[PDB]
Design a protein around this ligand. Sequence first.
Ligand SMILES: *[C@@H]1O[C@H](CO)[C@@H](O)[C@H](O)[C@H]1NC(C)=O
Ligand SMILES: *[C@@H]1O[C@H](CO)[C@@H](O)[C@H](O)[C@H]1NC(C)=O
Ligand SMILES: [Ca+2]
Ligand SMILES: [Ca+2]
Ligand SMILES: [Ca+2]
Ligand SMILES: [Ca+2]
Lengths: 276, 48
Amino acid sequence: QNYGLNIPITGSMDTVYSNSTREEVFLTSTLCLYYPTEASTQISDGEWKDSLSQMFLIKGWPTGSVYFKEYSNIVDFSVDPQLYCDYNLVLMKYDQSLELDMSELADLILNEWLCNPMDITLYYYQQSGESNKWISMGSSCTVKVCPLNTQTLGIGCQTTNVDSFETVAENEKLAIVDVVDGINHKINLTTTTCTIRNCKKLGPRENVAVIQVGGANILDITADPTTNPQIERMMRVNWKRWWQVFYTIVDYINQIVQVMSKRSRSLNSAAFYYRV
Amino acid sequence: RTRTVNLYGLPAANPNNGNEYYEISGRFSLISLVPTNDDYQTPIMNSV
Ligand SMILES: *[C@@H]1O[C@H](CO)[C@@H](O)[C@H](O)[C@H]1NC(C)=O
Ligand SMILES: *[C@@H]1O[C@H](CO)[C@@H](O)[C@H](O)[C@H]1NC(C)=O
Ligand SMILES: [Ca+2]
Ligand SMILES: [Ca+2]
Ligand SMILES: [Ca+2]
Ligand SMILES: [Ca+2]
């Protein structure tokens, strides 16, 4: 049996609101932070995890519910970001020249992706439509594509001479690459380090929220240029002191989780649905 | 002080001639076999 997917739910416009649920969502869910190593370095502590946990307890979350996680930086977190955890808040420090990789990480974790494998050395690969991308993750993802015409001969590049291949993203830990949809391609991607998946983009992973810490709003989650929507799960707070940032988070946690949702969680901590 | 004079050759009396060694240089080409199973040759495969 389905859960009732194709059955309508007749409601009403006079039923009275059921009462609050903040208490129950606190007592069930688990809040969870992803912060850079710079945060701990500037805090210069090591009971700060305990202090923040007790602050969250006073705010109304039971003890074993707030889990802190540490990543070296944005680009290195981008390599297979496994959100091992229920309500995800990714604190993310802005610095120049990280605009694109920061945006790519935000896209990857905010949206749900259905990823299939790709065998680069053997087959050519297209992109079906607007919602499909190629996501390449690893230690050194240099991607060089050669598009083929109707005659299986490359255009602007010969399939034999890899130098003529058009490089589309060099030396990123994560690269979400789009190419014109409907052309076969030959990819030269460094198979020892980097792995590349053909990923469709389903709806939004409406569980993880991204808190930018530095500059102006720049996260273009939608790769299409005509639209730059602003999701309520993309927050932006100025800063000088990481302690002030964490106190702001702890003080306003209720609003943040009210913005986020719990139902959109997956059994796997992976940030995509691998469908072989 | 002997019969044999003005003979062309090189006797074995003192061939070194006070030299530590006679030297020769050149190029040295070789086409010998070798086992290379590291290829495991069936990659030239037709990508399709
Ligand atoms: C739900 O909340 C309202 C708020 O006034 C309260 O009166 C009611 O008792 C609550 N429900 C139950 C079952 O206690
Ligand atoms: C990419 O090109 C380099 C060029 O030296 C080659 O060594 C490597 O095997 C190629 N990788 C793929 C997946 O074609
Ligand atoms: Ca070229
Ligand atoms: Ca990237
Ligand atoms: Ca595309
Ligand atoms: Ca856009």
